Coordinates of C-alpha atoms and ligand atoms in Angstrom, one line a residue:
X1 CA 0.0 0.0 0.0
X2 CA 2.8 2.4 -0.9
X3 CA 0.8 4.6 -3.3
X4 CA 2.0 7.4 -5.5
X5 CA 1.3 11.1 -4.6
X6 CA -2.3 11.9 -4.8
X7 CA -3.6 15.5 -5.6
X8 CA -6.5 16.2 -3.2
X9 CA -9.7 17.8 -4.2
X10 CA -12.4 19.8 -2.2
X11 CA -15.1 18.7 -4.8
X12 CA -16.2 15.3 -3.8
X13 CA -17.1 13.3 -7.0
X14 CA -16.0 15.5 -9.8
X15 CA -12.5 15.8 -8.3
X16 CA -10.2 17.8 -10.6
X17 CA -12.6 17.6 -13.7
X18 CA -12.7 21.5 -14.1
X19 CA -9.0 22.1 -13.3
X20 CA -7.7 19.4 -15.5
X21 CA -10.3 19.9 -18.2
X22 CA -9.5 23.5 -18.4
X23 CA -5.9 22.8 -19.5
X24 CA -4.8 19.1 -19.2
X25 CA -1.2 19.8 -20.4
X26 CA -0.6 22.8 -18.0
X27 CA -2.2 20.8 -15.2
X28 CA 0.2 17.9 -15.7
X29 CA 3.3 20.1 -16.4
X30 CA 2.6 21.5 -12.9
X31 CA 1.9 18.2 -11.3
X32 CA 5.4 16.8 -12.5
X33 CA 7.0 19.9 -10.9
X34 CA 5.2 19.6 -7.6
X35 CA 4.6 15.8 -7.3
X36 CA 7.2 14.0 -9.5
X37 CA 6.9 11.4 -12.3
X38 CA 3.9 9.5 -11.0
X39 CA 0.9 11.3 -9.6
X40 CA -2.7 10.4 -8.9
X41 CA -5.9 12.4 -8.8
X42 CA -9.7 11.9 -8.9
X43 CA -11.8 12.9 -12.1
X44 CA -15.6 12.2 -12.1
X45 CA -15.4 9.0 -9.9
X46 CA -12.1 7.6 -11.3
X47 CA -8.6 7.7 -9.8
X48 CA -6.2 8.5 -12.6
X49 CA -2.4 7.7 -12.3
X50 CA -0.4 9.5 -15.0
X51 CA 3.1 8.4 -15.9
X52 CA 5.1 11.4 -16.7
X53 CA 8.4 11.4 -18.4
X54 CA 10.2 8.6 -20.2
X55 CA 11.3 6.6 -17.2
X56 CA 7.8 6.4 -15.7
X57 CA 6.1 5.8 -19.1
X58 CA 8.2 2.8 -19.5
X59 CA 5.8 0.9 -17.2
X60 CA 2.9 1.1 -19.8
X61 CA 5.1 0.6 -23.0
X62 CA 6.6 -2.6 -21.6
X63 CA 3.4 -3.8 -20.1
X64 CA 1.2 -6.8 -21.1
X65 CA -2.5 -6.6 -21.4
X66 CA -3.0 -8.9 -18.5
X67 CA -1.7 -6.2 -16.1
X68 CA -2.6 -3.0 -17.7
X69 CA -5.8 -3.6 -19.7
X70 CA -7.0 -1.7 -22.7
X71 CA -10.1 -3.9 -23.3
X72 CA -11.3 -2.6 -19.9
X73 CA -11.3 1.1 -21.0
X74 CA -11.0 1.0 -24.9
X75 CA -13.6 -1.7 -25.6
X76 CA -17.0 0.1 -25.2
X77 CA -15.4 3.2 -26.7
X78 CA -14.8 1.2 -30.0
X79 CA -17.0 -1.8 -30.2
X80 CA -20.2 0.2 -31.3
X81 CA -17.9 2.0 -33.8
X82 CA -16.0 -0.9 -35.5
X83 CA -18.5 -3.8 -35.0
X84 CA -18.7 -7.3 -33.6
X85 CA -16.0 -9.9 -34.1
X86 CA -13.5 -7.1 -34.7
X87 CA -11.3 -4.7 -32.6
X88 CA -11.6 -4.8 -28.8
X89 CA -14.6 -7.0 -28.8
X90 CA -12.7 -10.4 -29.3
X91 CA -10.1 -12.2 -27.1
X92 CA -6.6 -10.7 -27.3
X93 CA -5.1 -13.8 -29.1
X94 CA -7.7 -13.7 -31.9
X95 CA -7.7 -9.8 -31.7
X96 CA -3.9 -10.1 -32.3
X97 CA -4.6 -12.6 -35.1
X98 CA -6.3 -9.9 -37.2
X99 CA -3.8 -7.3 -36.2
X100 CA -1.1 -9.6 -37.6
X101 CA -3.2 -9.9 -40.8
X102 CA -3.5 -6.1 -41.1
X103 CA 0.3 -5.6 -40.4
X104 CA 1.3 -8.1 -43.2
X105 CA -0.8 -6.1 -45.8
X106 CA 0.8 -2.9 -44.7
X107 CA 4.2 -3.6 -46.1
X108 CA 6.8 -1.7 -48.3
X109 CA 5.8 -3.7 -51.5
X110 CA 2.3 -2.1 -51.1
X111 CA 3.7 1.3 -49.9
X112 CA 5.5 1.4 -53.4
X113 CA 2.1 1.0 -55.1
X114 CA 0.4 3.3 -52.7
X115 CA 2.5 6.4 -53.4
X116 CA 1.3 6.9 -57.0
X117 CA -2.4 6.4 -55.9
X118 CA -2.1 9.0 -53.2
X119 CA -0.9 11.6 -55.7
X120 CA -3.7 11.0 -58.1
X121 CA -6.3 11.4 -55.5
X122 CA -4.5 14.5 -54.2
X123 CA -4.2 16.0 -57.7
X124 CA -7.9 15.6 -58.6
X125 CA -9.0 16.8 -55.1
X126 CA -6.8 19.8 -54.7
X127 CA -7.8 21.1 -58.1
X128 CA -11.1 22.1 -56.3
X129 CA -8.8 24.9 -54.9
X130 CA -8.1 26.2 -58.4
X131 CA -5.7 29.1 -58.7
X132 CA -5.9 30.9 -55.3
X133 CA -8.3 31.3 -52.4
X134 CA -8.8 30.3 -48.8
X135 CA -10.0 26.8 -47.4
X136 CA -10.8 25.3 -44.1
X137 CA -7.7 23.1 -43.9
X138 CA -8.8 20.8 -41.1
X139 CA -12.0 20.1 -43.1
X140 CA -9.9 19.9 -46.3
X141 CA -7.6 17.3 -44.9
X142 CA -10.5 15.3 -43.4
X143 CA -12.1 15.0 -46.9
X144 CA -8.7 14.2 -48.7
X145 CA -7.4 11.7 -46.1
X146 CA -10.7 9.6 -46.5
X147 CA -10.1 9.5 -50.3
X148 CA -6.4 8.7 -50.2
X149 CA -6.9 6.0 -47.4
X150 CA -10.0 4.5 -49.1
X151 CA -8.0 4.2 -52.5
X152 CA -5.1 2.4 -50.7
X153 CA -6.6 0.1 -48.1
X154 CA -10.1 -0.6 -49.4
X155 CA -9.2 -1.0 -53.0
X156 CA -10.5 0.5 -56.3
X157 CA -13.9 -1.2 -56.2
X158 CA -14.8 0.5 -53.0
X159 CA -13.3 3.9 -54.2
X160 CA -15.5 3.6 -57.2
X161 CA -18.4 3.2 -54.9
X162 CA -17.3 6.4 -52.9
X163 CA -18.8 9.7 -53.4
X164 CA -18.9 13.1 -51.5
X165 CA -22.0 11.5 -50.1
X166 CA -20.3 9.0 -47.9
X167 CA -17.3 11.0 -46.8
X168 CA -19.2 12.4 -43.9
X169 CA -21.2 9.2 -43.4
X170 CA -17.9 8.2 -41.6
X171 CA -18.5 11.2 -39.3
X172 CA -21.6 9.6 -37.7
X173 CA -19.6 6.3 -37.8
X174 CA -16.8 8.2 -36.1
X175 CA -19.1 9.5 -33.2
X176 CA -19.8 5.8 -32.9
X177 CA -15.5 9.2 -24.7
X178 CA -14.0 8.0 -27.9
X179 CA -10.3 8.2 -27.2
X180 CA -8.2 10.9 -25.7
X181 CA -7.8 12.7 -29.1
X182 CA -6.5 16.3 -29.5
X183 CA -9.6 18.5 -30.0
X184 CA -9.7 19.9 -33.6
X185 CA -12.1 21.9 -35.8
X186 CA -13.1 18.9 -37.9
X187 CA -16.8 18.7 -39.2
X188 CA -18.6 18.2 -35.8
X189 CA -22.2 17.1 -36.5
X190 CA -21.0 13.8 -34.9
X191 CA -24.7 12.6 -35.1
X192 CA -25.1 13.1 -38.9
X193 CA -27.3 10.0 -39.6
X194 CA -26.2 7.5 -36.9
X195 CA -27.5 3.9 -37.4
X196 CA -28.0 4.6 -41.1
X197 CA -24.3 4.6 -42.2
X198 CA -24.0 1.2 -40.4
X199 CA -26.3 -0.2 -43.1
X200 CA -25.2 1.9 -46.1
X201 CA -21.4 1.6 -45.5
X202 CA -21.4 -2.0 -44.4
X203 CA -23.3 -3.2 -47.5
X204 CA -21.1 -1.0 -49.7
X205 CA -18.3 -3.6 -48.7
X206 CA -20.4 -6.8 -48.8
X207 CA -21.1 -6.0 -52.5
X208 CA -17.4 -5.0 -53.4
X209 CA -16.2 -8.1 -51.6
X210 CA -18.3 -10.4 -53.6
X211 CA -16.8 -9.0 -56.9
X212 CA -13.4 -10.5 -55.6
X213 CA -14.9 -13.7 -54.3
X214 CA -16.4 -15.3 -57.4
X215 CA -13.8 -14.1 -59.9
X216 CA -10.2 -14.5 -60.8
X217 CA -8.9 -11.0 -60.3
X218 CA -6.6 -12.1 -57.4
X219 CA -4.4 -8.9 -57.2
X220 CA -1.9 -7.4 -54.9
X221 CA -4.0 -5.0 -53.0
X222 CA -4.9 -4.7 -49.3
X223 CA -8.4 -6.4 -49.7
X224 CA -7.0 -9.4 -51.4
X225 CA -4.7 -9.8 -48.3
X226 CA -8.0 -10.2 -46.2
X227 CA -10.0 -12.3 -48.6
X228 CA -7.3 -15.0 -49.0
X229 CA -6.3 -14.5 -45.4
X230 CA -6.8 -17.6 -43.1
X231 CA -6.9 -17.8 -39.3
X232 CA -4.5 -20.3 -37.8
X233 CA -7.5 -22.6 -37.5
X234 CA -8.0 -22.6 -41.3
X235 CA -11.4 -20.8 -41.2
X236 CA -11.0 -17.6 -43.2
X237 CA -12.6 -14.3 -42.3
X238 CA -16.3 -13.8 -42.9
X239 CA -18.0 -11.2 -45.0
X240 CA -18.8 -8.8 -42.1
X241 CA -15.5 -9.4 -40.4
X242 CA -13.5 -8.2 -43.4
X243 CA -15.7 -5.1 -43.7
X244 CA -15.3 -4.3 -40.0
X245 CA -11.5 -4.6 -40.2
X246 CA -11.3 -2.3 -43.1
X247 CA -13.8 0.3 -41.8
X248 CA -11.9 0.4 -38.5
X249 CA -8.5 0.8 -40.1
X250 CA -9.6 3.9 -42.0
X251 CA -11.1 5.5 -38.9
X252 CA -8.2 4.9 -36.5
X253 CA -6.0 6.8 -39.1
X254 CA -8.5 9.4 -40.1
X255 CA -8.5 12.2 -37.4
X256 CA -4.9 11.2 -36.5
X257 CA -3.5 11.8 -40.1
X258 CA -5.9 14.7 -40.9
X259 CA -5.1 16.7 -37.8
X260 CA -1.4 16.2 -38.2
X261 CA -1.3 17.1 -41.9
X262 CA -3.2 20.4 -41.1
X263 CA -1.0 21.4 -38.2
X264 CA 2.3 20.9 -40.1
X265 CA 0.9 23.1 -42.9
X266 CA -0.1 25.8 -40.4
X267 CA 3.4 25.4 -39.0
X268 CA 4.9 25.8 -42.5
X269 CA 2.5 28.7 -43.4
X270 CA 3.9 30.5 -40.3
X271 CA 7.6 29.9 -41.2
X272 CA 7.9 30.8 -44.8
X273 CA 11.7 30.0 -44.9
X274 CA 11.1 26.4 -44.0
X275 CA 8.3 26.3 -46.6
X276 CA 10.9 27.4 -49.2
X277 CA 13.7 25.1 -47.9
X278 CA 11.2 22.2 -48.3
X279 CA 10.3 23.1 -51.9
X280 CA 14.0 23.3 -52.6
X281 CA 14.5 19.7 -51.2
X282 CA 11.6 18.7 -53.5
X283 CA 12.9 19.8 -56.9
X284 CA 16.5 18.9 -55.7
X285 CA 15.7 15.3 -55.0
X286 CA 13.0 14.8 -57.6
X287 CA 14.1 17.2 -60.4
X288 CA 12.8 20.8 -61.4
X289 CA 9.9 19.4 -63.5
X290 CA 8.5 17.8 -60.3
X291 CA 8.0 14.3 -61.8
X292 CA 5.6 11.9 -60.0
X293 CA 6.8 10.6 -56.7
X294 CA 7.8 7.0 -55.5
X295 CA 8.5 5.4 -52.3
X296 CA 12.4 5.6 -52.7
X297 CA 12.5 9.6 -53.0
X298 CA 10.5 9.9 -49.8
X299 CA 13.3 8.3 -47.7
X300 CA 15.7 11.2 -48.7
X301 CA 13.1 13.9 -48.1
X302 CA 14.6 14.5 -44.6
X303 CA 13.6 18.0 -44.0
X304 CA 10.0 17.2 -44.6
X305 CA 10.4 14.1 -42.3
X306 CA 11.7 16.3 -39.5
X307 CA 9.0 18.8 -39.9
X308 CA 6.5 15.9 -39.6
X309 CA 8.3 14.6 -36.6
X310 CA 8.2 18.0 -35.1
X311 CA 4.6 18.4 -35.8
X312 CA 3.8 15.1 -34.2
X313 CA 5.9 16.3 -31.2
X314 CA 4.0 19.6 -30.5
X315 CA 0.6 18.3 -31.9
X316 CA 0.3 14.5 -31.2
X317 CA -3.4 13.7 -32.2
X318 CA -3.6 11.0 -29.5
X319 CA -3.3 13.1 -26.3
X320 CA -3.3 10.3 -23.9
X321 CA -3.0 6.5 -24.0
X322 CA -4.9 4.9 -21.1
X323 CA -4.9 1.4 -19.4
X324 CA -6.7 -0.1 -16.4
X325 CA -4.6 -1.7 -13.7
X326 CA -5.7 -5.3 -13.2
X327 CA -2.6 -6.3 -11.1
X328 CA -0.7 -4.0 -8.8
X329 CA 2.2 -2.4 -10.7
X330 CA 5.5 -0.9 -9.4
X331 CA 7.0 2.4 -10.7
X332 CA 9.3 4.9 -9.3
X333 CA 9.2 3.3 -5.9
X334 CA 5.4 3.4 -5.9
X335 CA 2.8 0.7 -6.3
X336 CA -0.2 1.5 -8.5
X337 CA -3.3 -0.4 -7.0
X338 CA -5.8 -2.5 -8.9
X339 CA -8.4 -0.2 -10.6
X340 CA -6.4 3.0 -11.4
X341 CA -6.7 4.3 -14.9
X342 CA -2.9 4.5 -15.8
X343 CA -2.2 7.2 -18.3
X344 CA 0.6 8.4 -20.5
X345 CA 0.6 11.7 -22.3
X346 CA 2.8 11.8 -25.4
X347 CA 2.0 15.6 -25.5
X348 CA 3.5 16.1 -22.0
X349 CA 6.6 13.8 -22.4
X350 CA 7.3 15.6 -25.8
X351 CA 7.2 19.0 -24.1
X352 CA 8.8 18.3 -20.7
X353 CA 11.3 21.2 -20.0
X354 CA 13.9 18.9 -18.5
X355 CA 14.0 16.9 -21.7
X356 CA 13.5 19.3 -24.6
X357 CA 15.3 22.5 -25.6
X358 CA 13.2 25.4 -26.9
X359 CA 10.2 23.2 -25.9
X360 CA 7.4 25.3 -27.6
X361 CA 9.2 26.3 -30.7
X362 CA 8.5 24.4 -34.0
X363 CA 12.1 23.6 -34.7
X364 CA 12.7 20.7 -37.2
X365 CA 16.5 21.1 -37.1
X366 CA 16.6 19.8 -33.4
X367 CA 16.9 16.3 -34.9
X368 CA 20.2 17.2 -36.6
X369 CA 21.9 17.5 -33.2
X370 CA 21.1 15.6 -30.0
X371 CA 17.5 15.3 -28.9
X372 CA 15.2 13.2 -26.7
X373 CA 13.7 11.4 -29.8
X374 CA 16.8 9.3 -30.0
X375 CA 18.7 10.0 -26.7
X376 CA 15.7 8.8 -24.7
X377 CA 13.4 5.7 -24.9
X378 CA 9.9 7.1 -24.2
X379 CA 10.1 10.8 -24.4
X380 CA 9.0 11.0 -28.1
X381 CA 5.9 8.5 -28.4
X382 CA 3.3 10.0 -30.9
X383 CA 2.6 6.5 -32.3
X384 CA 3.1 4.9 -29.0
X385 CA 6.1 2.6 -28.3
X386 CA 7.4 -0.8 -27.2
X387 CA 4.6 -3.4 -27.1
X388 CA 1.8 -0.8 -27.8
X389 CA 2.4 0.9 -31.1
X390 CA 0.5 2.2 -34.1
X391 CA 0.4 -0.3 -36.9
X392 CA -0.5 2.3 -39.3
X393 CA 2.8 4.3 -38.6
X394 CA 4.4 3.1 -41.8
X395 CA 1.3 4.0 -44.0
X396 CA 1.0 7.2 -42.0
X397 CA 4.5 8.5 -43.0
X398 CA 3.9 7.4 -46.6
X399 CA 0.5 9.0 -46.8
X400 CA 1.4 12.2 -45.1
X401 CA 4.7 12.8 -46.8
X402 CA 3.2 12.1 -50.3
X403 CA 0.3 14.5 -49.5
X404 CA 2.3 17.4 -48.1
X405 CA 4.8 17.1 -51.0
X406 CA 2.0 17.1 -53.5
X407 CA 0.8 20.3 -51.6
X408 CA 4.0 22.1 -51.3
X409 CA 4.7 21.6 -55.0
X410 CA 1.4 22.8 -56.3
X411 CA 0.8 25.6 -53.8
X412 CA 2.3 28.0 -51.2
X413 CA 0.6 28.5 -47.9
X414 CA 0.2 31.5 -45.6
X415 CA -1.9 32.6 -42.6
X416 CA -5.1 34.7 -43.2
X417 CA -4.6 38.1 -41.5
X418 CA -1.8 36.3 -39.3
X419 CA -4.4 34.0 -37.7
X420 CA -2.7 31.0 -36.1
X421 CA -5.3 28.6 -34.7
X422 CA -5.0 27.7 -31.0
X423 CA -6.6 24.7 -29.1
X424 CA -9.3 25.6 -26.7
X425 CA -10.4 23.2 -23.9
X426 CA -12.8 25.6 -22.3
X427 CA -15.2 25.9 -25.3
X428 CA -17.4 22.8 -25.1
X429 CA -18.9 23.4 -28.6
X430 CA -18.2 27.1 -29.2
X431 CA -14.9 27.2 -31.4
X432 CA -13.4 30.6 -32.0
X433 CA -14.1 31.6 -35.6
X434 CA -12.9 28.4 -37.3
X435 CA -9.3 27.8 -38.8
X436 CA -8.8 29.0 -42.4
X437 CA -5.6 28.9 -44.5
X438 CA -4.5 30.9 -47.6
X439 CA -3.3 29.1 -50.7
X440 CA -1.8 30.4 -54.0
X441 CA -0.5 28.3 -57.0
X442 CA 3.4 28.0 -57.4
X443 CA 5.7 29.4 -60.3
Ligands
HEM501 C1 -0.2 10.6 -37.3 C2 -0.8 9.5 -37.5 C3 -1.2 8.6 -36.4 C4 -0.9 8.5 -34.9 C5 -0.1 9.6 -34.2 C6 -1.4 7.3 -34.4 C7 -1.3 6.9 -33.1 C8 -1.6 5.7 -32.6 C9 -1.4 5.3 -31.2 C10 -0.6 6.1 -30.2 C11 -2.0 4.1 -31.1 C12 -1.7 3.2 -29.8 C13 -3.0 3.4 -28.9 C14 -2.8 2.6 -27.6 O1 -2.1 1.6 -27.7 O2 -3.5 3.0 -26.6 C15 -2.5 3.7 -32.3 C16 -3.0 2.4 -32.6 C17 -3.6 2.1 -33.8 N1 -3.6 2.8 -34.9 FE1 -2.9 4.7 -35.1 N2 -1.9 6.6 -35.4 C18 -1.8 7.2 -36.6 C19 -2.2 6.8 -37.8 C20 -2.9 5.6 -38.1 C21 -3.2 5.1 -39.4 C22 -2.7 5.8 -40.8 C23 -3.8 3.9 -39.2 C24 -4.3 2.9 -40.3 C25 -4.1 3.0 -41.6 C26 -3.9 3.7 -37.8 C27 -4.4 2.5 -37.2 C28 -4.2 2.2 -35.9 C29 -4.6 0.9 -35.4 C30 -5.3 -0.3 -36.2 C31 -4.3 0.8 -34.1 C32 -4.5 -0.4 -33.2 C33 -5.0 -0.2 -31.8 C34 -4.4 -1.3 -31.0 O3 -3.2 -1.5 -30.9 O4 -5.1 -2.1 -30.3 N3 -3.4 4.8 -37.2 N4 -2.4 4.8 -33.2

């Protein structure tokens, strides 16, 4: 019973709901100062124990689901979203069976095919912009990412079936507490047409899937990985299971990729020098005529890579990873009891003053010298770390770098009247005047 420091509260049940909810990052920064790397506090009935800093976060990253449980906090968040027999509604071994099926289909051989497809979808979409004007970038990315992701993981049959009609039918699907995401100004009807997309979208897949079943167009696309995929008991995945796995893979990468793409642009629309140094790198690595991209070139676009890593450092779309303690855990000379909701914050760890120089500046060149991203284990964890890591990370870098390149080539970006959008935790539904960006064609 040697429990970590616990921040007390004068408000019985809500605890620190207001203080924390007002600014979670500032709250936790202050808590690390006052209380150390492992602190507890009550919020709306639950005791939360945060692991702050790399050395404390090591507990969760090196943990097993039998001790720190995701299916005890992340299951009824996701199950109404992804479906039955898929995601956190199945036993971990068969859960991890499908995850190993997904990770096989997300390989370099496919990433080489994916880079062309992403550019075509970007070129036909961003033509809507025309010559010059101003767009809502968060909304712009939301729509583009759906198309790009759909035309890579779902196939061409399902892309053919896709129209501007269904793009927001994912929004009601997205609605269904859902994950500690960074708040953003994406289209937020959330309700849209609940219960209706579940029929529309699911049957969109059944039909497309049957075209691949009774036919001999066995191709190398992600869907053909799942149709031919067999469990380790021989039985292959059913019709509804394959659809659930594909729907869920586009949703887990939607807001994440969209929010990051937008923030990086805003960060580059603020610093015009870096936006030029990037364009230099583009025509210098690919040639001045800007020929179509391919996987290989992406690996040497290092400035873009360091801008993306710096974006993910300051604006990680997953704000907090959470687990429920089923067995007592030991960290920093403390024992976390059964029933605590153990939390790691990539945002905090990637901002901690005792680990990052110029913590709040968007400085991509910090990776050219020493930094915590390589010099520490769990100080830079946008995609997670260790045993708990994003399987879409490889597709993410490919998708994001291809998209941003296709943008920085065909456009230049700047802030409208100098407006740089800020995240507000105090505005429940009343966002401050929406985020807009300025675009103008190149040359
Ligand atoms: C900037 C982009 C992204 C970030 C920062 C991100 C972040 C994360 C993180 C931190 C996790 C671990 C959550 C946890 O263990 O509690 C995760 C899991 C996952 N992500 Fe992402 N992700 C991104 C993009 C994507 C993409 C593009 C896909 C799919 C194409 C995707 C699919 C998944 C899936 C399937 C999981 C599995 C959840 C599990 O392990 O049980 N994500 N992501």
